[PDB]
Amino acid sequence: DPVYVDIDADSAFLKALQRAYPMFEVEPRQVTPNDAANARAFSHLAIKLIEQEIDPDSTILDIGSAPARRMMSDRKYHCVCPMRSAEDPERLANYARKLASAAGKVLDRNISGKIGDLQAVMAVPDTETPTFCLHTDVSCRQRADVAIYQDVYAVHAPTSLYHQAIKGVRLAYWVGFDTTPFMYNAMAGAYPSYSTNWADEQVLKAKNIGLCSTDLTEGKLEPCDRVLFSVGSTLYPESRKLLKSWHLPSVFHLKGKLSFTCRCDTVVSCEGYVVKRITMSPGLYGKTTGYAVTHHADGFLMCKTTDTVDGERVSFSVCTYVPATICDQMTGILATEVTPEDAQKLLVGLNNTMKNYMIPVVAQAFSKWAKECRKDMEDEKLLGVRERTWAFKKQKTHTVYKRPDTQSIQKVQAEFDSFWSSGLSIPLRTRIKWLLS
Amino acid sequence: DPVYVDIDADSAFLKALQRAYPMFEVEPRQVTPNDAANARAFSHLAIKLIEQEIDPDSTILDIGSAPARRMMSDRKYHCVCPMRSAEDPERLANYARKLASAAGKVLDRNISGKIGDLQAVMAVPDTETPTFCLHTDVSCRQRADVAIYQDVYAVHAPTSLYHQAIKGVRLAYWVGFDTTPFMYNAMAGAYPSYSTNWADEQVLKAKNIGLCSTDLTEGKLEPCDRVLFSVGSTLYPESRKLLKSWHLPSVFHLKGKLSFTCRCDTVVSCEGYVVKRITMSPGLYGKTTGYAVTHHADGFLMCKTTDTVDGERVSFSVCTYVPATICDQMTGILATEVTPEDAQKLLVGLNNTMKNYMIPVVAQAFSKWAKECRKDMEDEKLLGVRERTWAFKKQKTHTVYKRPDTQSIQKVQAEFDSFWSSGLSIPLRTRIKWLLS
Amino acid sequence: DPVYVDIDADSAFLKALQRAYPMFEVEPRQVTPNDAANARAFSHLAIKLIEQEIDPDSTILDIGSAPARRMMSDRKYHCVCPMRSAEDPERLANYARKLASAAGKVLDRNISGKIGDLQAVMAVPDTETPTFCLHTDVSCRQRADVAIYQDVYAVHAPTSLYHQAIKGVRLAYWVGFDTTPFMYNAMAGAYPSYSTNWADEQVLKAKNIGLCSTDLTEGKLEPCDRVLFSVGSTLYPESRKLLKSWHLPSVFHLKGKLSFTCRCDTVVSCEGYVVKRITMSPGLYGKTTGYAVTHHADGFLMCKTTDTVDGERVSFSVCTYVPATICDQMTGILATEVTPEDAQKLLVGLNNTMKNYMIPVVAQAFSKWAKECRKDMEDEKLLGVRERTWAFKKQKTHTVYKRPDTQSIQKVQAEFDSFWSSGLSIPLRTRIKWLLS
Ligand SMILES: Nc1ncnc2c1ncn2[C@@H]1O[C@H](CSCC[C@H](N)C(=O)O)[C@@H](O)[C@H]1O
Ligand SMILES: Nc1ncnc2c1ncn2[C@@H]1O[C@H](CSCC[C@H](N)C(=O)O)[C@@H](O)[C@H]1O
Ligand SMILES: Nc1ncnc2c1ncn2[C@@H]1O[C@H](CSCC[C@H](N)C(=O)O)[C@@H](O)[C@H]1O
Ligand SMILES: [Mg+2]
Ligand SMILES: [Mg+2]
Ligand SMILES: [Mg+2]
Ligand SMILES: [Zn+2]
Ligand SMILES: [Zn+2]
Ligand SMILES: [Zn+2]
């Protein structure tokens, strides 16, 4: 009945987890000093919930999978496992090792069948087995009804979903980080509850952001495609286009040789991690608007800041998340004009609910926001009238602040109409064959 | 005997629910983290009360229905289900799935008959069955005596009611959001107890309203038909004309080939959600005035505010709801002239009874209202006399404030005299047929 | 023995009810969220008391009745039910439905006879039965000895009473709102204990009265016949002439072909609701004066106020009721001159005994009254002398204040000498016939 997570029994994250999964009983049982524990716990609980949702005797496609995670499960999984990243051979070797280790002690699972399928794929690499294949998402021939994406950021979402749908899949899930900070086009940012920082490749030599490094000395800039992610002490390169492609609107159409109508919604949300549910049906129905909405339970901040990159002083924008209680407790102070130092002292007085290294920039954002409010109250126009004497002036905005219980809305695309080699090596196949034997 | 609702046991909304349904026993039993829970609970209790009102052995038309909600009920429902929105195929598939799942475990309900009717409609799409059809409201041929509208905002009320009445219906119900803010012709607004914000399509790029999104930068306007609604994180487009059409007067006439006299009244009201009861009788009787009345148990505010839309500074009107206790506790302060900052500090001191993101604009409205009162006391006219020396000046009004235990009144129309394709697809029909089997 | 009322067990109104009916035991038993509960409770208790007064085996005429209210009573009622308003067909249908529902379960009442009379009237509409007819008050042929008017404001009182008296009626009762504010000729007013506001048709676009509605903008008047009443959220149009006609003097004469001497007195009075008892006797006796008296247990206020109607600033008079304890506690302050703001703060300090939305205007009235007193003390005349040098000046009066334990007196008329179609439809008759069967 209860679910066990590998975090310390005194952490404050546990509270939040119990709020996000009220249908479970969460128990802390710590065994490793892992520095990316919270993300692992969230993914574990998400998979538990998804399994509890769908009915048995349904085959499930696992896109970009690590097979060792699905061994002790009683459901039917077909793992789609190409070898495109540098961490895949180790995952395959670990899977083979774990399969060999427990060969007669566990009998309620299809262990012998799994070994047979692995050996068959090793012998001939272009064959589909009930539990394994070596193709990509757009070339696997297996037919199923459910698909799952877990921490997959390297595919174009509409094309992948269309190729999943033309094979009879009616339900899909997606687990990963929230894509909202990338629709605002920021330079760098943090997910502080998960110990995650990310930065654009051009500001890696800054001084006072989460992920940077610089030296000692005596004495156009716009976002690009390539981004670096750091979860704990693990590094991942990412692309802005593919991250943006997963920010889907509420309803959309897929129009090719066959046609489908699909809808997407968010079912779990905890401080930056989300779970998305997508349903697809045959035929065209209704009409689309092209808007995507995000609900904010915490505060979301984006602001402009000044730093030195490689010794040269520049300015760019950063984003972060703020707990709701602090935002509620700062309501009265922001009615006047306040300097950044006083705001910093007040925030330190209220605070650990939030990480300290993020405080100095937050205090700089609030101070600006309040000021921009006062000016609005002092230059009051007339109702239903615009002045455009033919040019009109644009005011300056240095801060965007989405308070708890508000919503963001953005215009995206909603109509889509436009949409092999083994890669393995002889020594790796021989090693796997010997490991199984 | 008791009724269970899917909200947390510590929420303050529960209190209000117990005040709106004093004939029930409300128990919290939370199973999902749904962010639109309060609206669902209100709708659930409303349906329970309506069922407890009318007598059994009466057939009930369900206009624009989701059939899966009526499966486990012992009453007789005829669901009118066209496919005009993009969320309908999924609802139909869910209905078929739920019907198939419980086929022999539940025997007190007409499960087998429901399956037979669904299969018959799938085989031929232009046939009426006792529990299902695929026509619209003005083309269904079934005869009944009660009709129900649940969260239906996309029909013209007099025409629909006339077509319901010429078929022998004598009673109707309507559940939805209050239409008063749209008779005042506001730009944007909030229902804060239900986590709902709405805005006109022209101000979606503002900065400091509930539903908007903007960017960072260095540097005639009147309401239109199209409106956007956001309930939790679900988005709905709406039209002002159809929303306004449901704000009916106390008595009205329907004059066509046959004639009817009808009357409408509000029976449940909780912070923005209402239940309306309409009765229709044959023949013409009495005479009409054309007025509609709203009773305010909380405070209702409408005020003018200044913002920047896409960088350009403009002014427009917003509306909101205020709890009665705060309004009662602000009576003494508003006897003098008060600045917005002092009002903001006082409101924060009194406050969480109300959401904080709504406070800064409320504090701006009160401050103006009080000032407009003082001027009235300082320019006193004579009894029963008007000055029109031929033009007379009009004063300026920046705030409308309806205090608890007051009433709004508005002039509307009260005399009405002026009032098909399957749309389904072969793959969807085949999928439903296979799902049932 | 005890009487049950549909109000909440914590309301302060209950106290007052127990003071008005000391011969009963009042118990709260709340079942509906009705917003006009207090008026319903008062009417219920009034009917109980009237029934307890008169002796049995007397037939009672019920003028302008709703028959469903008299079904479960053991007395003999003859209901006079024309169809002149738009709410009558629904009342008739409800009566028929309730009659059909309990046809064999209740046997101590003349249920079968009631059904027979209803069917007979349906068959032929111009016949009198022991319990039903379709005529007006001046055309019913039934003979009785008691008549009852319950919330009837649409008849001319002397003519109706004469036509009741020429048929052998010797006693009559009247239940309704107090008519005193209409003999003072006010523009608008409130009954705050019953959640009732009323206004003249010409000031429906004001801003700061109980019943009004206005908009946002940048920039002879005398009372007329038509008035609007709002009880909770129910709207009723009324005429000033017919309301005034029910303010009868202590003794009066009816002189026609036959002659009668009648007298009227008030027997129950609670914060605006009254019960009146009228007795009529054959022949002419005594002589009349033509005065009507009202006793005040609470404070009654009438004052001049300034507002904006449709944007134009005007002045008119409003009236209200004030609890006796507040009036007693303001005696010492009103010995000097006091500003409206100080009076508002003092009233808020004393106050919830009274509704807050009525406070700002009350504070404005008191402040004026006190001032008008000081001037009187500073311009002192001689005993038994008038100055009329031939014109005399008239002073200005802006407030009328009737304190508790005082009496109003007014001159009215006391000598009176000057005093049909079915209207039903075939479909309604058929519907009633089918409902009974
Ligand atoms: N086009 C494609 N189709 C299917 N899988 C792909 C793919 N491109 C990359 N991948 C795989 O996606 C994986 C992302 S790493 C994610 C691994 C796994 N989901 C986990 O939870 O750890 C990589 O191993 C890569 O091999
Ligand atoms: N003219 C019409 N007649 C009948 N139904 C209509 C209609 N126009 C739209 N509808 C239906 O009304 C529905 C509104 S969505 C409401 C669904 C349901 N009442 C619920 O509680 O969830 C849509 O599914 C749409 O199919
Ligand atoms: N001239 C007349 N003679 C008798 N009844 C009349 C009348 N004019 C109007 N009425 C009736 O008086 C009623 C007033 S509404 C009052 C209904 C009832 N007394 C109650 O307590 O609810 C209307 O239904 C109308 O039909
Ligand atoms: Mg690791
Ligand atoms: Mg939902
Ligand atoms: Mg009513
Ligand atoms: Zn495969
Ligand atoms: Zn039908
Ligand atoms: Zn009669």
UniProtKB/Swiss-Prot annotation, chains A, B, C:
Where does the UniProt annotation locate this protein? Host cytoplasmic vesicle membrane; Host cell membrane; Host cell projection, Host filopodium
Indicate which residues the UniProt annotation says bind Zn(2+).
Answer: H78, E128, C133, C140
Q: Where is the Alphavirus-like MT domain?
A: 27-247
Q: Where is the active site?
A: A36
Annotated site, Involved in the phosphoramide link with 7-methyl-GMP, chain positions: A36
Q: How is this chain modified after translation? A: Palmitoylated by host palmitoyltransferases ZDHHC2 and ZDHHC19. Palmitoylation is increased by the interacton with host STING1.
Membrane-binding and oligomerization: annotated segments: 283-419
- Topology in membrane: Lipid-anchor
Q: Summarize subunit and interaction data from the UniProt record for this chain.
A: Homododecamer. The enzyme forms a membrane-associated dodecameric ring with a central channel for the exchange of between the viral replication factories and the host cytoplasm. Interacts with non-structural protein 3. Interacts with RNA-directed RNA polymerase nsP4. Interacts with protease nsP2. Interacts with itself. Interacts with host STING1; this interaction results in inhibition of cGAS-STING signaling and increased levels of palmitoylation and protein stabilization of nsP1. Interacts with host TMEM45B; this interaction leads to viral replication inhibition.
Q: What is known of its domains?
A: The N-terminus binds a zinc ion which stabilizes this region. The C-terminus is disordered.
Physiological role: Cytoplasmic capping enzyme that catalyzes two virus-specific reactions: methyltransferase and guanylyltransferase. mRNA-capping is necessary since all viral RNAs are synthesized in the cytoplasm, and host capping enzymes are restricted to the nucleus. The enzymatic reaction involves a covalent link between 7-methyl-GMP and nsP1, whereas eukaryotic capping enzymes form a covalent complex only with GMP.
Protein name (Swiss-Prot/TrEMBL) = mRNA-capping enzyme nsP1
- Show which stretch of the intact protein is covered: 2 to 473 of 2474
